[PDB]
């Protein structure tokens, strides 16, 4: 409640945040395949008599099967061009009031006033009658202008943060992790992800950047991990869900081949036709290539702490100063360096 | 059920359901059952060296 | 209008598969295909163990799919087709000819849809099979053979990170340099291993040179690669037309019933190019198939990119709070309003509009009751090894009346 | 199309009509662009009977 | 589209032109004045 | 092999010169650059400082 | 068994002709000084001493 007072007035509490948002882009691809890439078997066609609304519906079904008769890799694809981005690169704050399951506060007046205050100054909110035995879907709006809104999840960190960590491809957890570091045993995924007796693997000097979102039971780990399942009832997608959950692992295959299997067109973990980027709807099979999800990394975009630094007086390219006095300007290190015109 | 000509005729037609602690597989269909008319078969599509 | 009929063999995607007829497919439980691959060696001396040759036995299995197509009939069509030598008058005859005309016209497109959708299924399976080039090509090169240690593997992984960050949109970035596009198209082609060579009649060109693959794009990329990058080899191709039917009979039939096991040109107008040293098809099948039908085209896949921004971090070290010039951003106020700790972050929107994330947006996350769910955390930390420590700073006593 | 494809498309049309507005007197010094978008204009309209 | 294009306008005649014998100025805000760069479709036309 | 000094303080009073007046200025009354250096900053294999 | 033994013996006999090139590469790398030292020795000094 006091932190609500401070953030509303203009005070700066002794805490700092990192924002994480996922953006989707339409790409044109290019596939090459060898000669005998497939043994493709054709069955026998059969018909189903089936009654319908006024008459009959004849369904013609023909079964078939395929074999990859290549000893190695016989087909390769690579994304080529950039089309228009589907999503909106906006600022829609994540609401944690869509979730049910945590221990409530003692005075219901405080919780109701806190939800009412949080609903002010935001876009997506739970509806006012609070539907018990329901999904807490946010109220739909009028027409939309520039695409699907992309939510931004906030992860807390201590204020004294090495800012040079955010100028390259970093990890929102503060400690780089993943299955990719192996070579000796089986249960070294847990030691890399959570064990703080030994130091970090990537930034090879220290334990972890923010000690509030990196341990086994830290605040960020208790909040966003899917194993604890705190935001299960929330219908909106969490863009930092893939960074905190340990992936299920079988250690029979070597690392590089399983990296190649994880690199294919994985099924999407968001919604396309809907407006607020909700969770994955069942029955929806759309395959999207997902870079920087199998490497457990996120790219920093062109961002600055002041509008004065972000643009220069030359009628052309953007500004380029790194830090002015206490502000900063992180230069773009994403794969979309020369695209998305400004 | 395979449509194989039996090698020898069985005598002493008695109740066989009672003495089922003998044998390693005992199945008793009443009149007819669609499990008999199943023909799932496994196939090999060639080798390459 | 009159629809055109597409034949699957005449498409240039037909070279990527071997279609064989199989009537008794629905009785097949598992399919088995086998490989017996051997490897050579060299002999050396010194402090190296002598080697014995290796043989590899790999086995693969089929994956069964399906194709479904619907076809509707109105009730009145059934009523006027249920005559059977009762009528023949001059009023309902015209309605009967209209009914059977709609019957044939509908059934023709239903029969065409399977030939039209087999190419869709090959695109689906080839997208589900192919690894990315940015991950296939460094592994095929930077490790010589395999069985790597930790170190060279870690260096390879760092190379992969840099390659994905760099070479992701290389068609739309380096479009002003045609020399590089034909430089990595041959890198794409000369990175995949070939397949088996057994066949009777193959896809050839007019001269008689055997083709080596297919390269499928979007039509715009076909135009861009075709105008000035690659070189045309021929305009017509020789394409096999028959399927190849095999059936089980005799000893195979009795084995399948008893034991449960079993064992085993045309000229088409299509453009062919040569890339590297190999001759490939180049098809951008968008007008023949996927035209004016409600299905989306593959090769229009999506990618997801995650963006991260620090929000209110204050640079603690007094060394790092430096200005590059004296009078950079002066203000009329007696105190410069930039020494203060920052409270917001400014980025750019999709259209280029400047937007702002202020700390007031964080009340949806930090002002929840989930900040005070310390109970499960306390349960987790109470179940580990703790040593006997002094309790000076955590113990509160009571007065003793003195 | 759904909502989001229509919205992104409308943003694309807005930017395109703001840019591609006087495309002969802006890009007059480049003979390659004019012959490039004349073939875009001609190969955009459907034929007739 | 129900929109409107902003042309080259400024609150001060001092900042709208530069001393280089050529193009116009580009500094957006000086102390409390402003200069709005031309975003209309007539960018390379209407001589100044 | 790579070589780098860490705590070297330029002892000559002439040698401690600045190329310009306001090169790296600060807010405090005493700039933290006349003080003797204690560390060295270089680049990693991947380009991380 | 005899087919496996013959198929094995063929690769074993192949290995000597495949490893002769390895031994030649080994002696030629241990026999070769660098270019960046051989080139100015044979150029700058006329004969020696």
TrEMBL record, chain B:
Which organism's genome codes for this protein?
Answer: Human herpesvirus 3
Name of the protein this chain belongs to: Major capsid protein
TrEMBL record, chain E:
Going by the entry's taxonomy, the superkingdom of the source organism is recorded as: Viruses
Q: What is this protein called?
A: Major capsid protein
Originating species: Human herpesvirus 3 (HHV-3)
Q: What is the lineage of its organism?
A: Viruses, Duplodnaviria, Heunggongvirae, Peploviricota, Herviviricetes
**Gene expressing this chain:** ORF40
- Interval of the full protein contained in this chain: 1347 to 1394 of 1396
From TrEMBL, chain G:
- Organism domain of life: Viruses
Protein name (database record): Major capsid protein
Which organism does this record belong to? Human herpesvirus 3 (HHV-3)
Its organism's taxonomic lineage begins at: Viruses, Duplodnaviria, Heunggongvirae, Peploviricota, Herviviricetes
Q: Which gene encodes it?
A: ORF40
Query: Entire protein: which part is shown?
Result: 173 to 221 of 1396
